[PDB]
C-alpha cells in the first residue's frame, strides 16, 4: 500500500508531464462550469474529478490503495465520456490521456 501509493504519485506525475500537455491540459484542474458556461454539468456529473484533486487526495493520504487512486482517475475520464457527445475534441484528448494512465496502472 505505502510503496503502491508512491507508484500512483509517479503515474500522476507522468500524466502532468510536458510531453502529454497538448491533450492532458483540460484535466489539470476542476472543470470551471461557470467560466465555460456548462449550465447542466453539475446536473449530469454528480462526482467531478480532476488531476489537481487526485494530487491533493494522494498528498492528504486519502487513498487506501492503488485501486482507490485508479477509481478516481477512471472517474475523471468517465465524467468526460458521460457529459460530452462522442465526437467532442475533449473526449479525444481524454482517451489519449487514458492511454498513458492504463499502460502505467496495469504494469505497477
Ligand X SMILES: CCS(=O)(=O)Nc1ccc(Oc2ccc(F)cc2F)c(-c2cn(C)c3c(=O)[nH]ccc23)c1
Cα separation of 51 and 103, whole Å?
A: 17
Any contact of residue 90 with ligand X (CB under 6 A)? yes
Any contact of residue 84 with ligand X (CB under 6 A)? yes
Q: Give the nearer residue to ligand X in terms of CB position, either 16 or 68.
A: 16
Any contact of residue 15 with ligand X (CB under 6 A)? no
Residue span binding ligand X (CB under 6 A) among the ranges 7-15, 29-37, 63-71, 100-108? 29-37
Residues near 77 by Cβ (< 8 Å), separated by ≥ 6? 94, 95, 97, 98, 101
Cα separation of 71 and 66, whole Å?
A: 8
Interface residues with ligand X (CB under 6 A) are: 26-29, 31-32, 36, 80, 83-84, 89-90, 93
Amino acid at each position: 500500500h505505502m510503496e503502491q501509493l508512491k507508484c500512483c504519485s509517479g503515474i500522476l506525475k507522468e500524466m502532468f508531464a510536458k510531453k502529454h500537455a497538448a491533450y492532458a491540459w483540460p484535466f489539470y484542474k476542476p472543470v470551471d462550469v461557470e467560466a465555460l458556461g456548462l449550465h447542466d454539468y453539475c446536473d449530469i456529473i454528480k462526482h467531478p474529478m480532476d488531476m489537481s484533486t487526485i494530487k491533493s487526495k494522494l498528498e492528504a493520504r486519502e487513498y487506501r490503495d492503488a485501486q482507490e487512486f485508479g477509481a478516481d482517475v477512471r472517474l475523471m475520464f468517465s465524467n468526460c465520456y458521460k457529459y460530452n457527445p462522442p465526437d467532442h475534441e475533449v473526449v479525444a484528448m481524454a482517451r489519449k490521456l487514458q492511454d498513458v494512465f492504463e499502460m502505467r496502472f496495469a504494469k505497477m
